[PDB]
Symmetry: D3
Subunit: 159 residues, 6 copies
Amino acid sequence: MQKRAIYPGTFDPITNGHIDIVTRATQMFDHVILAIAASPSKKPMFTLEERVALAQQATAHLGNVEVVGFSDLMANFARNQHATVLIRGLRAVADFEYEMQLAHMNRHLMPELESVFLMPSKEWSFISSSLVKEVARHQGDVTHFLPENVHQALMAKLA
Amino acid sequence: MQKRAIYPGTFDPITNGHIDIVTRATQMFDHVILAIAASPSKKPMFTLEERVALAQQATAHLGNVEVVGFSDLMANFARNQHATVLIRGLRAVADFEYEMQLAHMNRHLMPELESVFLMPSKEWSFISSSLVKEVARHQGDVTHFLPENVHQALMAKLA
Amino acid sequence: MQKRAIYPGTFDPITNGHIDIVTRATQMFDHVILAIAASPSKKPMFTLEERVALAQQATAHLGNVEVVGFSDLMANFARNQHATVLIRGLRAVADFEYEMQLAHMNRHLMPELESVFLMPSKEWSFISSSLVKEVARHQGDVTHFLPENVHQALMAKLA
Amino acid sequence: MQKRAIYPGTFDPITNGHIDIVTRATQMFDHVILAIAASPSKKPMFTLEERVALAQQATAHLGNVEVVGFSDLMANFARNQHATVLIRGLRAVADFEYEMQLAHMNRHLMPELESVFLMPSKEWSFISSSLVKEVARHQGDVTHFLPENVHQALMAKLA
Amino acid sequence: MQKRAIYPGTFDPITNGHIDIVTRATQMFDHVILAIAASPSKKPMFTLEERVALAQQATAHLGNVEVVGFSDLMANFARNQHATVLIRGLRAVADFEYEMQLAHMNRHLMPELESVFLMPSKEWSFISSSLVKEVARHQGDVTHFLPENVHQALMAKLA
Amino acid sequence: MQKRAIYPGTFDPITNGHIDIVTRATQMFDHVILAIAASPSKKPMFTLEERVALAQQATAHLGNVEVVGFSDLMANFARNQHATVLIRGLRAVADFEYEMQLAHMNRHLMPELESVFLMPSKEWSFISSSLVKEVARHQGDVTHFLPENVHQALMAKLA
Ligand SMILES: Nc1ncnc2c1ncn2[C@@H]1O[C@H](COP(=O)(O)OP(=O)(O)OP(=O)(O)O)[C@@H](O)[C@H]1O
Ligand SMILES: Nc1ncnc2c1ncn2[C@@H]1O[C@H](COP(=O)(O)OP(=O)(O)OP(=O)(O)O)[C@@H](O)[C@H]1O
Ligand SMILES: Nc1ncnc2c1ncn2[C@@H]1O[C@H](COP(=O)(O)OP(=O)(O)OP(=O)(O)O)[C@@H](O)[C@H]1O
Ligand SMILES: Nc1ncnc2c1ncn2[C@@H]1O[C@H](COP(=O)(O)OP(=O)(O)OP(=O)(O)O)[C@@H](O)[C@H]1O
Ligand SMILES: Nc1ncnc2c1ncn2[C@@H]1O[C@H](COP(=O)(O)OP(=O)(O)OP(=O)(O)O)[C@@H](O)[C@H]1O
Ligand SMILES: Nc1ncnc2c1ncn2[C@@H]1O[C@H](COP(=O)(O)OP(=O)(O)OP(=O)(O)O)[C@@H](O)[C@H]1O
Ligand SMILES: [Mn+2]
Ligand SMILES: [Mn+2]
Ligand SMILES: [Mn+2]
Ligand SMILES: [Mn+2]
Ligand SMILES: [Mn+2]
Ligand SMILES: [Mn+2]
């Protein structure tokens, strides 16, 4: 079957953890939409424009990945995009109770959208965009957790 | 014995989950005070006035329920109201560590107030007011999680 | 109202933690039935008869407590005891998860039997029958965690 | 793409929860192998042959499901079945922790076998084979949690 | 060996829980730096100056404790201070997933800095500075959780 | 100061995870006692003598490590070894809960024996003796998770 999956998030910025997850998704699903939310939600270090461009570059090597931005309800977008699979990354440091809440709400909103939880490499299982941003903003080295293009952009952002 | 119990919260707005919990409480305790906190805590979608009126309507069918608003320390109000039972709803997606912290603090503040944790129906075990508000604010259908009166009020609020 | 509550468990043996919980229960409800399950699958250290005796003496000072043993389905025994409140203790977090399962199953078996979780004192928040037995198997001093009569029995049973 | 997925477990016995998960799997992948592990260390109630039979009938209505038993290393069996997706169900939180261990071990044993966690309906989020057996050992009504043929087998096995 | 340990935090204000942890640290390590972060992070009830002075007084009886303030990355300061041990208090109500995330990030940033988790007395295992501040700000008694000097300062702050 | 630390466990068998933890301990304290408990109730795969031998060789490269077996109460053995630091490893979250219980019990038995939790590398954060044995029972390759001598022993023991 030709499944269309959606992998939503703020990607602010996209990390090696995100790349790990989306790469794993492309191996089991025909088309993967990496959906970037225009979430002013607490000042996106990067803007949607930057957010999208960085993601497009970091996943350019992935043939069946499509980077697209969206506003408001993720489920409404997933429905319009005809996605039937919702990719969620599950870190060792994940808020499981929250993921359950989100998945059940998304199922209520769009039952035809099935939540699929993927696990990243042990290497990226203990980090997050906010932690990375916080560390970088406070003069810490986060080179190891980001694609080269994102690393360069981050330095420009904090300079 | 004639126990007086208090069921505190922001009820912003009251949901079917809250109704579930308070209804279960009225079956084991003589008088249940549904206490609504005037918690400006991050802009109450609804005002205390609205908050109270909506709750009064949603629990009007419950004979031994009294909806009352209060400000500042919940324990101080519970003490003045002569409550000896503190109702706490325990969702499957609850922050247990937080509930423990809260209960122990409340016990220090008022040892004569006993924390009672009740469990809602599987139906409401994965939702919360903030999630409901967030989904509704972003164009999602939350009709299923609210009493009719609250549903109508919510639509007016977001229009 | 005069509610009848049941506090089921293996109580092998009953500890100060159990005493703490049942005591809190007697202050909320008219009559409390401390129900000891045979639990053959657990290969209890003490026989049902022994555990019943131990608990009886350990709770003799509590006028409205009744100790009874049972091998039936807890739900059926609860219904037959005319109990409408099911008491459970919440100390540690992985207990909560297991407790929700039994609670939802028990609600399925007897919907009018309302689950009520109570929280023990900080003093007994880290003990369990199995841990006390483990320490006692190695001759460690567990006098602080058990009722006088239970400690003697545990000592005599292990030597 | 035509992916082959494997859904391993002890299935002692298979429950509606398992049915829920495998069903969600058949809607995402072309072929699903419901693999029943011998699991001698668990001292299963039903023999491998019995569990296989039970599952076969319980999933007969699902065209792209295949039930097979195995005593090999799950990873090796997966490779030999030509599966590239490993299905796992996430109901409760302590499962998630244990699941990450097996997932990371299995990824170490077969890196191309991608772990996929699915979430069951709220309806079966609190049941397990062991709990159903426990209730059944006490003659409790478990018809609601098992496929018709499994319930009969469970009844006949316990009397 | 002569180990130099660092115990970082906002100490806003320092509580009996903090005193408990730092006291335990001084018993196993030669020199303990109680590092106070100048974290404007959501309006420090107390200023760094106040924060430091209160801590110095509350730990004056501890000979090998040095109270020092720092800004930005904790790891950068720890490195400059030549610390090889990082003290983290682990409460029963701790965000473990967060502690893991933090520890792994700190290990990436400074591998020569080893994270050591200490456990406070049952007495302080269910509280935190934010909860204490919130309760006090809302007219609750928090005398029991603070050193006398902090208690006096807190009352002045809220008057 | 010259502290003596004890790292107790069943070590059945000792894994790279254990090696990771004890190694971190030797860098903080002068002398470390890796204490292997008989743990008859666990029905260990290897005898105490075997586990001691295995650990001795597995930690021979660590000058300040001492391997000893014991069947006494861990607290008493710690006191008799003149240890004032109790080393424990924290990998997964349900371990933390169980660890707090033993820690509080051990503090009750020997208040001057301070509990110290260390965190293993991401590399060994998902392994355990039981999981390695489980994989090995099915002939899976576990060379990556065990010291050379332990792997041989495990291979020879299972065939
Ligand atoms: N390092 C990672 N490994 C695996 N999954 C991840 C990782 N980081 C994020 N995810 C997952 O990707 C999705 C989107 O996450 P998001 O865009 O918020 O980035 P984030 O790192 O989680 O941000 P933040 O640090 O603000 O929490 C979520 O399902 C999340 O669990
Ligand atoms: N759906 C629900 N089922 C059971 N208990 C609930 C539910 N929603 C809230 N509660 C409980 O009722 C009490 C008050 O909760 P509150 O008023 O904050 O609503 P809320 O849904 O928890 O809000 P929020 O989404 O902002 O977290 C708490 O003890 C909470 O656990
Ligand atoms: N120390 C304690 N504090 C609070 N509740 C407790 C405590 N010990 C047991 N309980 C609760 O009492 C009920 C019965 O528990 P049980 O009879 O199994 O004793 P137990 O200590 O939990 O045994 P075990 O060590 O085998 O787990 C459960 O709901 C349990 O959560
Ligand atoms: N009710 C359920 N809902 C969702 N997933 C489930 C459910 N029961 C089992 N699973 C999942 O299916 C897989 C196999 O589980 P298993 O065969 O052990 O049955 P089980 O119910 O988990 O047994 P037990 O009661 O012995 O723990 C696991 O990944 C498990 O998480
Ligand atoms: N009562 C306590 N017992 C043990 N450790 C504590 C306690 N309070 C704080 N800690 C630990 O000390 C360190 C610093 O904590 P912090 O300075 O943020 O105070 P805090 O109480 O955790 O603040 P907040 O209430 O805002 O969360 C952390 O590692 C934290 O876990
Ligand atoms: N891989 C690991 N990483 C970090 N700490 C570990 C690891 N394995 C064990 N430990 C810790 O070492 C101590 C002793 O553990 P133990 O000897 O039981 O081995 P184990 O792996 O935990 O065994 P089991 O598989 O039976 O649970 C415990 O404090 C435990 O948390
Ligand atoms: Mn996130
Ligand atoms: Mn809430
Ligand atoms: Mn128990
Ligand atoms: Mn299972
Ligand atoms: Mn904090
Ligand atoms: Mn262990």
